């Protein structure tokens, strides 16, 4: 009954909540204050689609969700090859519920905020081996909810549910005042530029109010990786607006006036995607659960980070709460994670790593014929909600195919 | 906001209830009485994991939870080739959250009687194409939701998800009182008949109140495809016993004394798994939505078809819901099953299908191994509750391996 978590982040945050409501004493240990965070640079862009919302919900926890525009539907573009400032593909797709943005500087130390009135007991510190040791000494379970802070190292590497050891993309997020809103509905706008990279843009919530967020993916060495000689917000602006100039013109017309929401509100980095093994063993040989980044770190090409860090506090939180009064021990711990891997964040993660490599012809016939069949254009937007809905269909080209078939019969 | 369902089972009436809360108006068509199921033959041994079980608990239907025995795990045994009357696989791993079996008998009935205390219109006629044809001129979306009924080959199967085209099983159930209670916790005993068949048991809530059920499956053919000479309830029992003498004695230990629950608690029948196409077009043009069984049709062995069923109407309820005021033509009906079908029923549909035929070597050695290795035998166990979680390592031999390490390594 007595639970501490390393890591005052999403899931971290949503897991200790949910055991709060549920009667168990929760440490939790941040390496931040709420203010600092809140005032901080941006850290994700956290678009969460509806199964995501809904738990959120379900806890109590949506508490941004009347004032945070709504994201309805996903676009996909790509540019003509031949004709000039056009493009060859351009459809969109209704979500059947809507998705939403709230940026984490304002729910992290909202939900800080909250933990602290429910009773949890906020510990800052910027947690080491040490607070560990002592932890699994004075608790009956240890999480690692620590995202990709360096303490998250302490997990081995599992080789072969990682085919990638190197960024696969260069990113950058520009969070904008002043872009023109989508007509007729709001969407995640997919631009695809072939060998080059893509640009996502969608409404969102942020410490200013509503807002856009620009979201840059480059492939490495290419002409969207071109964050390193950016040097002040102003220059980080600029270059935003030239990708868009550069590539994606139709976006530019949008985006005549736009400024920072604020100079905090950029960001540029990379990293490589990495599934770690559940069960880290410390020097004494107590043992620790990793938990959401710490053991499934994806691209953010998919969006789908936040989405598995709260499906993956869920699956937690139910496995403490039906272990009851069992041991919390390494086998619980490796079980408790093979249901979220193997019943679903397999799928997000094996379809993640296919599309940060090329296309393959039957995935660009697949994109082209969603334009002229909108239930295979629905089919994709609705599958960010549960990307196992994309399989076989969209990895196997028999099968995409076939299901292209069944979206026709219907459209 | 009209809605009406033809087939007044687990998947249609859990369907209309929700509905019903959820301000519709719900036409249901039933060809029998509520009495005349309730005294009338069993249909199931419907085992519903606790997954599906909170389906219910949070429409409210969970109306036998308390007299309902609960099932807390899954034993596997297999006879010893050479030493008589042994065993050379037996163990046994705890779920880690109740299963429970409510004698349909029971539950439809009562819950055709909520359904007309909360306002459905239950019409009571043997519904054909003519009633479908009416119900789709007064009605926003109409399902057919009939089970094995003949009215379900309205729907074109799909050869393409359906590798059988003939029963891989000879069934039979036999309800019994008097069974000796398993020690020290009750279980699915799992009894594999190498060559010949499977016979499982569990205990159960019927309508003379709690049983077990036997449940005994028989490829085509063999020893066990034993029912065709059985004709009155006594011949039924008598060769339930025989079956228990003959392959499994150590079971046969704990059935001295048992007795039939009634007359009618006995079955004995096959059937081909079958996938249908969801949409079916009626001659005026106007379409109908097949729903749980009419569209995913499993043979019993993974004690799967219930829990389908809730689980497939839970997700055509919330795609209902999400639609709102939107139209339900054949795309919404389409990826409507599309999501219950690549999100889950396929990953069901394919495990169960496997099991059907011989079992590769990896696949005895994985039940082997679970006799020394709890940690796999608690996977195998928990993966009735999500049968998603058994891919990739179920189906295949080198990721098998690197499966039973994992569980070796936190044993
Ligand atoms: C550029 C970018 C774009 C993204 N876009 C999206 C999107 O559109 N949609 C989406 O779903 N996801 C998106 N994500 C992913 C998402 O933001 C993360 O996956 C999510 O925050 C993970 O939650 P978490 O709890 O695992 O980690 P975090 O939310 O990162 O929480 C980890 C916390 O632990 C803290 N910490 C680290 N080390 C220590 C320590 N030693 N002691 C104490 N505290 C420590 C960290 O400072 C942080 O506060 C994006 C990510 C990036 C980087
Ligand atoms: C031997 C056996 C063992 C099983 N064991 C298990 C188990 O342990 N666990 C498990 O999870 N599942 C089990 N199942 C499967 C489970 O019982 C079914 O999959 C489940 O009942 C399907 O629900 P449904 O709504 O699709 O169909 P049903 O529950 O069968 O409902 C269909 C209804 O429609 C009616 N109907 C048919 N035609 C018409 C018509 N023209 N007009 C009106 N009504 C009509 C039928 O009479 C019936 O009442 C078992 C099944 C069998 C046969
Ligand atoms: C930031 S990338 C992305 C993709 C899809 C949805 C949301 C975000
Ligand atoms: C009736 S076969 C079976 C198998 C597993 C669980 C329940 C039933």
Redesign the pocket.
């Known amino acids: 009954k007595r639970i501490a978590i ?7 945050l949503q897991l200790g909540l949910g055991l709060l409501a549920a009667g168990y004493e929760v440490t939790m ?4 204050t709420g203010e600092d ?1 809140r005032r901080g640079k941006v ?6 689609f509806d199964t ?1 919302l809904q738990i959120e919900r379900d806890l109590g926890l949506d508490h941004w969700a009347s004032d945070c525009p709504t994201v309805d539907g996903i676009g996909l573009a790509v540019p003509h090859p031949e004709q000039k400032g056009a493009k060859v593909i351009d459809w969109a797709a209704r979500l059947n519920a809507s998705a939403q ?1 709230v940026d ?1 500087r304002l729910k ?1 130390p909202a939900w800080m905020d909250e933990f602290q009135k429910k009773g949890g007991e906020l510990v800052f ?4 081996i040490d607070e560990l040791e002592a932890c699994t000494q004075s608790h009956d379970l240890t999480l690692v ?8 190292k302490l997990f081995e590497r599992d080789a072969h549910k990682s085919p990638y050891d190197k960024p696969q993309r260069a ?1 950058a ?1 520009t969070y904008v005042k002043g872009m023109a809103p989508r007509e007729p509905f709001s969407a995640v706008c997919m631009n695809l530029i072939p060998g080059v990279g893509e640009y996502f843009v969608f409404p969102a919530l942020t410490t200013t109010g509503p807002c856009e967020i620009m ?1 840059f993916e480059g492939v490495p060495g290419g002409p969207m990786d071109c964050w390193a000689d950016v040097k002040t917000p102003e220059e980080h602006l600029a270059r935003s607006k030239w990708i868009l100039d550069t590539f994606t013109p139709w976006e530019a017309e949008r985006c005549k006036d736009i400024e920072l929401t604020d100079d905090n509100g950029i ?1 540029a ?1 990379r990293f490589a995607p990495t599934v770690r093994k559940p069960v880290a063993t410390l020097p004494s040989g107590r043992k620790v659960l990793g ?4 053991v499934v ?1 994806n691209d ?1 090409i998919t ?7 709260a499906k993956c506090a869920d699956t937690y939180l139910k496995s403490i709460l039906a272990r009851g009064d069992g041991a919390a021990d390494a086998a619980w711990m490796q079980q408790t994670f093979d249901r979220y891997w193997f019943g679903y964040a397999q799928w997000v993660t094996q379809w993640t790593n296919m599309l940060l490599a090329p296309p393959p012809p039957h995935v660009l016939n697949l994109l082209g014929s969603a334009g002229a069949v909108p239930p295979l254009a629905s089919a994709f937007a609705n599958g960010f909600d549960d990307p196992r809905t994309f399989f076989p269909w969209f990895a196997d080209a028999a099968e995409s195919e076939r299901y292209i078939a069944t979206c026709a019969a219907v459209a």
């Open positions: 390393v890591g005052a982040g999403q899931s971290g240990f941040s390496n931040r965070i850290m994700s862009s956290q678009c969460m995501s943005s984490q992290i510190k910027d947690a080491g909810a620590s995202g990709k802070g360096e303490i998250s990113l997020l979201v960001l980095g938990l959401a980044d710490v770190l953010p969006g789908q980070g936040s989405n598995n860090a």
